[PDB]
Amino acid sequence: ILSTASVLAFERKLDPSDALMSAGAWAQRDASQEWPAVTVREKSVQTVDVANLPSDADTLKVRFTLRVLGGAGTPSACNDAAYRDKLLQTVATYVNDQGFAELARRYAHNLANARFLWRNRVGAEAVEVRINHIRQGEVARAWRFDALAIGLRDFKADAELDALAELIASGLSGSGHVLLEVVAFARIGDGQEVFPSQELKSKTLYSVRDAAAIHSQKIGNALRTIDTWYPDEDGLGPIAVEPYGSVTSQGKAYRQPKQKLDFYTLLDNWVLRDEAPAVEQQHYVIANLIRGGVFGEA
Template sequence: MAKSNIPSVLAFERKISPSDGLLYGTMWENKDVSVPLRLLEKSVRGTISNRLTSAVAKDPLKLNNDIKNSNPQTVDCCSLPQDCDTVKLEFTVKFLGNVGVPSACNNSEFKNNLQLAVSKYKERYEFNVLSKRYAYNLASGRYLWRNRVGADAIHVEVRTIGNTLENEKQFIFDGKNYPLSNFEYSDPKLDELAKLINQTLLGKTSLTLKVTAYAKIENGQEVYPSEELVMDKARVKKSKILYSVNGVAALHSQKIGNAIRTIDTWYTLFSDKLEGVVPIALEPYGAVTTLGKAFRHPKNKEDFYTLFDKFALGEQLDETQLHFVIGVLIRGGVFGQGEKE
């Protein structure tokens, strides 16, 4: 099959579907009692701290005149109550099967060849590597994001709910045992959770998990919900708007999903073992918006489309390239030839 036969319409449903995450305040020694965290609005008087123009930088009088002008800002904020020392995050996440089966495809020959390639991957690797890394991220509390940084302790509870398992299972993890820089640590609890995810991706069962994570950050400390993207800044008076659900501070489901699929250690810079290089989320171009960088540039032929086209057309990929391609299919998206052109 020629590359020209890659369909113009090709889409895959995501196989990892998290909910929004709600934030609560509690005490580390008494986690059974918690209170919803609310957003507060405050107005502050900031100082001029942006880079100066050359004219202002060279003229002390102009700088002093600028400094005299305050920089008032109205922002959303969120903090633990003074009688709470721990932030609690709750969300659910559903894993689905039928990996590699397009939800839309206008080329039956391509679809058949793709499913054959996916079947070969499943026979050789199942989803063991990917499942272990998804489980690792659930256990580590990576989805706490900035709320995890500097935490004295991290406690994670993962419980199966509403699925076809005969008996409910619960897993308890010490998030500090799972470094975010790699996926080398393992234990029997992690292996068991990974097996449940693996069986689901293989289509043998269904799986929905309730995840509750606790980070001890001390009394009254600031908490970091998701920040809203303001499209029309001219009409919005606040310089920072935080996310809430029915009045409860929250993390976007997209932010939680991004953390769960932050498993890509197969890009070139990571394999070069450069200092400070960390796992990134599975993205077609390895995009990390906070760094303004694409770690899988097409010119290096390690982006998803280059590898996926080879994979679907029956060409050989190495093991790490295969894990990356299948991981992006699990992520889901629209990958038709027309979208590239």
């Protein structure tokens, strides 16, 4: 019968680190070693936490480490072994049709522009992203990109954008380790107030050790913002790849369950009735496989 397993947990690939912040000045970013970090301080307005850059600083210093593991088709916690097997060859045929070419290119777009600076890119007139590929302890090959050229709605093509395509897709296929250190530099302004991740004194700003930082799952959501095959009306842009296409900014969830385009029915249709979805539609299915979940029959 090949029914859906009760537990269908998938591991989280594309691991993001805690993105710390620090303050610095433009045209000095070549010496990216010892800038002091922005510290969360207490101010009274009710008292809330506020994060501010010093006077002699106008750019951010977001650092985090990214790992590409691979084997996204392998479930860690699967109830049925035969149902586990079918998902293994179903994604294996997907690899044969395309070798993670489109997913890695759109994953490259997330890693190219500083969309993961949610608030610090909108009010910034100049953003630069430094990408380093660390292997064995040394930078095998480096990148210097610009978030201005690569827009957050259109997905353009570039030779250096394709450079990250074969690096990420090789890791996602499971052919080797991929370690990328992503450094960002966005000109938000001299002493402009920054919105980091907020903890729970009515409001608390997150820190790791005397330094403001961004949550790992916060960086991941922007890196999953590639879903453009949802029923886009009103000119909405790319959305984060979520089950049942939920976005909480508008308060409405796209990819409604009443139609045949959500993650749950498309994955069910592919492995149970054994008719493949569209090429554009199946690009969204494995995108949820890579991020993982608590999927399964309830």
